[PDB]
Amino acid sequence: SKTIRSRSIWDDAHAMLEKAKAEGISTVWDRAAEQTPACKFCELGTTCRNCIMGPCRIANRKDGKMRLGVCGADADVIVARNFGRFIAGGAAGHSDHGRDLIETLEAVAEGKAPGYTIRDVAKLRRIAAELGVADAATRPAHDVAADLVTICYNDFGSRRNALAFLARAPQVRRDLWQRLGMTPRGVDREIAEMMHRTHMGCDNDHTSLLVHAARTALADGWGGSMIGTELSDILFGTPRPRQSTVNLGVLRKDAVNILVHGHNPVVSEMILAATREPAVRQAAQDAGAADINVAGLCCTGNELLMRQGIPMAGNHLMTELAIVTGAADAIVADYQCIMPSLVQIAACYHTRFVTTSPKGRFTGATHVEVHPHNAQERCREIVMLAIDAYTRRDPARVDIPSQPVSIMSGFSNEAILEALGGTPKPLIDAVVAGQIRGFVGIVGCNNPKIRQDSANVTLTRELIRRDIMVLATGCVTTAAGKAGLLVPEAASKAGEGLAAVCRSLGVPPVLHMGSCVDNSRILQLCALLATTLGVDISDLPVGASSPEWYSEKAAAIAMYAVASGIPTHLGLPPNILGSENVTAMALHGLQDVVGAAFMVEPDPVKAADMLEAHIVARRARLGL
Amino acid sequence: SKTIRSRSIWDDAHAMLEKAKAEGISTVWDRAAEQTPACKFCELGTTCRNCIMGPCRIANRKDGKMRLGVCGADADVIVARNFGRFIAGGAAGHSDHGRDLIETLEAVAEGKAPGYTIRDVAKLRRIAAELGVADAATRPAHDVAADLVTICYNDFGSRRNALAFLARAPQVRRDLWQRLGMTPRGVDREIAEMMHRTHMGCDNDHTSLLVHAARTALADGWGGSMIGTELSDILFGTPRPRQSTVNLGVLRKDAVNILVHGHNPVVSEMILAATREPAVRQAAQDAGAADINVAGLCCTGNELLMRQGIPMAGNHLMTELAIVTGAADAIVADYQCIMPSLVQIAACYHTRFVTTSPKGRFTGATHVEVHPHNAQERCREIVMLAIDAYTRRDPARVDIPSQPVSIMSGFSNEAILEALGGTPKPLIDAVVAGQIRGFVGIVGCNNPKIRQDSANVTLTRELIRRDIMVLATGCVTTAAGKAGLLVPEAASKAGEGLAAVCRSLGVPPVLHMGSCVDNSRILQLCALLATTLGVDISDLPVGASSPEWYSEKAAAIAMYAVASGIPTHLGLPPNILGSENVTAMALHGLQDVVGAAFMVEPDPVKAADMLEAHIVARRARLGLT
Ligand code: SF4
Ligand code: SF4
Ligand code: FES
Ligand SMILES: [Cl-]
Ligand SMILES: [Cl-]
Ligand SMILES: [Cl-]
Ligand SMILES: [Mg+2]
Ligand SMILES: [Mg+2]
Ligand SMILES: [Mg+2]
Ligand SMILES: [Mg+2]
């Protein structure tokens, strides 16, 4: 089918799209077509629904009418407020994620989280000492954890002048933030202040609104997400390199297939542990299965991949198709990016759709709520539901379409530094020598507006060919993985300089650095490289790119990348083009404020040219 | 003009609308007409922009298309998420306001706020003791203040199971909230969680979303707003009854007129103090003025009215018209409900438009930022800017249209209890005897969709005629004031029972209880009455109404009133009618969950009937006639 061919580059997606059509199942692509064309005001950002003096629409008319909202706000204010709330929603997703990790580490410290423990005590003592816990090296681990919990919770309070992890950024960058009024102070506080500023008659200056949008996003990258990443490593282990597989072929016809979907490893790690219990495995055998097969979707899949090597079934636009295989015995979801259509598609089969979070409620789902105190018992209950669902699987509707593709995951900063011998000097030397011209983090989503993973894969191939190492996170992981680029042998696809470094280290030219919260690792790596060189992050040969983004979370990541000094490419524009001034600020003006700006370019080859050009200019700023 | 008559019931508004039209000045009414008809999907709530898989619209088409967003979300989810973010924006406005008061009290306790003091130490010690500060009755005031600051900041953290002031609610109500998952835990936390829940692929159950909307609003009424009110009383004094005046006639042709606008008294109290410095008064006289004349707009005006008796120039839809008088020499703004049109209208005159908050930035304004450590110095600079602007006032463009109307303000709960002799017993006795059949808080805004204050005033008149005492806050204050209902003599307009009680106490039938954050005073009063009677707030003969609301803050107030058990009337619907299920939950389903629901009724006489009928039903359950 020509329609099916245009929706994805992958054979496993094509096969399930044909199967979905044959069974009359509507997918995200079908609903995207129904919503095209979109409302032009909504797409431009020139619409406001923030009070019931409105709603209002703005147009650039010669007769002067509809130039202002009822309150008098112009297009610049309305667009900037909409963008600010958009970013705030993204930051809030990461904020609540990080908060849940704090609450879990606290439950461990109190001895009230059966089945949870401190799995990297060394990192616990290191992070606690870094953030100022007294005698972190020698005090009992639970006491050190309790003090770290208090520091993290205080960053979710209203009394700080700067977030705890912000001290990682170079001094020149913290000084710049302080002067600009951009320093993030509290993870929840910046979000709440954004919602206040965007109320009618509060912040009515587009520049001020965008500066606080930067501050809100920085409170994510250096706050909610960084706390999420570092505490997840403490609770579940610091990732180290390991082999795994990717695509729908990780599902097994002869096993109980449990797909974990969503974001928080507090749930998926305990689902995994439940499947490994002897009596639970025995119950699956008694049902006729060969074993229990856990496979990951989206970010929680990234987390199990990074720490346990659990194979990943797919990314955002693969989620509906994973159920269409007919082999998904249960989906276990927590929150964020879980399309509610999955509840209806699961209803077409035997599949149990299980929700686990009080925040991720889906009408018609099977709710088995999970908290640290009951997770071990509840996750065992959930696996038994999956085994019971497996006994009702219709074999005539099963179609697992592909063979899995080998990948290498686990590239935490700890893992990168260990592969380098313990210091960043061999990496710095390769950059100075020009073997590695720079680094680009390719992050973010899929979007039905772009043929699935076409731009993600093309940009990855273009960059490594130009001796630019790629750091992959989020749903881009599945793209690079299915393209064969997450293995050391993919050095054959890189330019001469990058291939030589990769082969000397035994690593791929594309390093999987984790989930979307683990974009905080890229911030940490840039801060480390800048501090070692005595420069700003805005002087490093780095870039960021989300060629196929969709979510508010992705926009917040892009904003905190830009605000931290990292030129950031987006394949698609945010809904801001109705304000020329807001657009010019995002694409150009921010360069003169924070030392980086957004780029919007749907051609991934042209995006590669633009990212490379910034890297070249940065290499000149360093006199290379 | 028939068009001008239809926009407001007030002569001062009519006069300035005529003047604005003659000078070619566009007002909020003119822009409301340009924006009518509105977008159908935006009006119904059936549109979503929460990701760039969209934007999406939900339609009812024969081919069945556009029933779902690209992610699969239906109309119920989209409408509920939109209403949830709407509520979170209102809660956030009050939240940041309360936070600023915490930071001000902390600066005072540290001795780093020249010109600020603890004006009500007795209330400081009482509130601190109520919230658990050890030895609040005896320790040094600055130590007690530091400990109270810590308790208030902890409610803006992420470690509480319940907000500190929630203990005021009766146990039965706290038990209900706890079972429902509605207990507010952290003022910022609930707002952040709402923004998370409304991200694509998180909370996709409309009942769940509305329950968290209730929790988010409760974190305002029992958190951000109540902290704001109580700390404002501690810093600037507990309101007591006093006389003042209202309407555009409070401006003086012979004076430097400084209009304070916005919400935070931390600024307007220090502007007022600066105008009272002898050297600053002398500068105004040397410029030709008789004096400096501070007048209030919107909530910061309510604040200065309640605590200093400062006359109030007008409410929401009067704000542009106050500049059209040609006598506004400076507008001093902080944040919230400040229409950016005021910047352009000021530019048509000599008026200086001064912003004072890092949060309230206006392109083209004169920014003179104010913080506790520099407010005394900066507010003096702002008043000197106003005196300079006065020297450039064009006398030929001045038209102050009316004579001011006398009002009585200052009815804090402390003042009400003092008028009752120290206890609520005489008020309960009047309620039991049926002299006062019930109480209704009339709160909230103006809205160009309704002839200004027509519904505010008609509802107030209808209720007091039916022996229902009215508690007025926000922009309703100005409406009742200009109607002549905020004075003791207005008992003549109430029914026989309410008139007798009012005359025995010497109070008006309409009690001004302050600004929009001071709607927390109404929550405190209901909680006190419920606890004294041993019932829930949902058992009290009470109601709430915003006949002419517009803001997200007003919806958050309505939501936390409903969630606390207060039947709440809105003159206009929120943008939710695109979902019958969400609408039915708001208007009916909540009744069975929290003991109260929303009502939507644009006819203020019918609104009076519905509010009274709820009051009659609650009086029956108390065993009264
Ligand atoms: S805030 Fe202003 S632009 Fe937005 S809906 Fe209200 S009146 Fe219209
Ligand atoms: S969240 Fe769902 S309904 Fe909203 S814009 Fe995105 S795809 Fe459309
Ligand atoms: S749907 Fe109302 S403006 Fe786009
Ligand atoms: Cl035109
Ligand atoms: Cl508590
Ligand atoms: Cl009722
Ligand atoms: Mg706990
Ligand atoms: Mg500033
Ligand atoms: Mg301070
Ligand atoms: Mg619950």
Author numbering:
A (entry chain A): 4 to 627
B (entry chain B): 4 to 628
What does the paper say about this structure?
The C-cluster is the site of CO/CO2 interconversion and is composed of a [Ni-3Fe-4S] cubane connected through a linking sulfide (SL) to a unique iron site (Feu). The overall fold and cluster placement of DvCODH is highly similar to other structurally characterized CODHs.
We next investigated whether this altered C-cluster state is redox dependent. Remarkably, oxidation of the reduced C-cluster by exposure to O2 results in reformation of the unusual cluster architecture, whereas both the D- and B-clusters remain intact. Together, these results suggest that this altered cluster is an oxidized form of the C-cluster and that this multi-metal ion rearrangement is reversible. In the present work, the metal migration of C-cluster atoms is more dramatic than in these other examples, with Ni moving ~3 Å and adopting an entirely new coordination environment, and Feu and SL moving ~1.9 and 2.6 Å, respectively, with Feu also taking on a new coordination environment. This C-cluster rearrangement from oxidized to reduced appears to involve what amounts to a ‘molecular cartwheel’ with Ni, Feu, and SL following the same trajectory to end up in their canonical positions.
